[PDB]
Amino acid sequence: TLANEDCFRHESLVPNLDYERFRGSWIIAAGTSEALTQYKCWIDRFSYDDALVSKYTDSQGKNRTTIRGRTKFEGNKFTIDYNDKGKAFSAPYSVLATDYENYAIVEGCPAAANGHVIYVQLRMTLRRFHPKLGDKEMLQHYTLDQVNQNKKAIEEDLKHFNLKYEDLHSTC
Numbered sequence: 001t002l003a004n005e006d007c008f009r010h011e012s013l014v015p016n017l018d019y020e021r022f023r024g025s026w027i028i029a030a031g032t033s034e035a036l037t038q039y040k041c042w043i044d045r046f047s048y049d050d051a052l053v054s055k056y057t058d059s060q061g062k063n064r065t066t067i068r069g070r071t072k073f074e075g076n077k078f079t080i081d082y083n084d085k086g087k088a089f090s091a092p093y094s095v096l097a098t099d100y101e102n103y104a105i106v107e108g109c110p111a112a113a114n115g116h117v118i119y120v121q122l123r124m125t126l127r128r129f130h131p132k133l134g135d136k137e138m139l140q141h142y143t144l145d146q147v148n149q150n151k152k153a154i155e156e157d158l159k160h161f162n163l164k165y166e167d168l169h170s171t172c
Helices: 138-149 151-160
Strands: 024-031 040-047 051-057 065-074 077-082 091-098 103-108 117-124
Touching: 024 138, 040 138, 091 151, 103 151, 117 138, 138 151
Parallel strands: none
Antiparallel strands: 024 040, 024 117, 040 051, 051 065, 065 077, 077 091, 091 103, 103 117
C-alpha cells in the first residue's frame, strides 16, 4: 500500500494533489541520483485515468526508449507499475511540491536510482515548445529556459527540503 509506504523521506506540500491538473507531459531537468543520469531528457506523459508513457535516450541521443505503465494516485502519492519492460523504474513516488502549470518536485524509490531520488520536472507542452529546423539541442534548450523561468519558485520549494538546484545532477 501507498498508505503504508515507508521509503518516502519528506512531507509533501501538496497532500491533496489534484491528479487532473497534474496530468500531462513533464520533462525531468535534474535529480539527486547519479544512476538516473544515464537516461537523458526523460519525459513522463500521465494521461486519462491511469496511463503513463515514459520516453528517454542515452547521452548522445541514441537508443530512444519508451516504457509504458499504469499509475495509482492517493493524494500526492503515486505508484507506477511498468510492464516487464522498465521494471527497474516501477516504484512508489510522491509529489512533494508543484504549481501544476510549470514545475514539480517529486521523490521516489526506484531500483534504478539505487532506491531513492528527488527530482525536478518542468511541464512539456507545445504551447511553450516550438521545435525548429536545425535545433540539435532541442529538448536541452527548452528545459534550461523553463528551469530558468521558474527558478525562484523551484529554489524556494527545494530549500524547504534541504536541497539547492545547483546540487542536483543535470539530466537533460
